[PDB]
Amino acid sequence: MVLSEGEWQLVLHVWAKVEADVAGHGQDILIRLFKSHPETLEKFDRFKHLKTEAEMKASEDLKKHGVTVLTALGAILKKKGHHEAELKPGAQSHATKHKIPIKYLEFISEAIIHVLHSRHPGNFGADAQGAMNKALELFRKDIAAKYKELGYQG
Ligand code: HEM
């Protein structure tokens, strides 16, 4: 698939807002993922022990990881589809070290859309959400194709 320039503009316009507070958005998103799909928490040996949202909010370690996740995703989005090289080392770690099924990448995609919709309603109307959704679908498809080349396709 290919996003048009106007689609990339809607994505990067809301992303610019997100970047005013990377740590707070990172936290909101991981917590939304873990609350909505608790099975995903099981993949993190680092956070497996957290029992409530309160504990999650208080974890500086979780917040640090949120920053890491959104910084990597932001570097990919800013490539506007030219992300081949950037994708490769994360596809390999997520496929053979962490073992993350594509299903779970769909789950964090939903969490991202939820949080942006809640925090940026004026910049995240139907057209901007449609563009972000296509950008995340592009990302998942390319990561799925890499998974296949690497032997996981899990
Ligand atoms: C937008 C999707 C995602 C991005 C951009 C992302 C990015 C990253 C980055 C940059 C790291 C650190 C370096 C590395 O190990 O590659 C990481 C580690 C990790 N990711 Fe992801 N990730 C994503 C989705 C997920 C999902 C959905 C899960 C699991 C449900 C997951 C599980 C992990 C685990 C287990 C680690 C290692 C945590 C530790 O430090 O112990 N990731 N991720």
CB-based contacts of 137: which residues, under 8 Å, 6+ apart? 1, 109
CATH code of the domain covering residue 51: 1.10.490.10
User: Which structural domain, as residue segments, surrounds residue 1?
Assistant: 1-154
Annotated binding-site positions for O2: 65
Sign of the CA dihedral 110, 112, 113, 119?
A: positive
Which residue numbers belong to the known binding site?
65, 94
Q: How far apart are CA 60 and CA 58, in angstroms?
A: 6
Question: How many domains, the chain?
Answer: 1
Residues 125, 150: Cα–Cα separation, whole Å: 37
Is the CB–ligand 1 distance for residue 69 below 6 Å? Answer: yes
DSSP 98: S
**Cα(59) to centroid of ligand 1, in Å?**
17
Q: In terms of Cα–Cα distance, which of 96, 10, 11, 108 is closest to 66? A: 108
Q: Is 93 a pocket residue for ligand 1 (Cβ < 6 Å)? A: yes
Experimental method: X-ray
Write b or e for each residue in 123-150: b if 16 or more Cβ atoms lie within 10 A of its Cβ, otherwise e.
ebeeebeebbbbbbebbeebbeebbeee
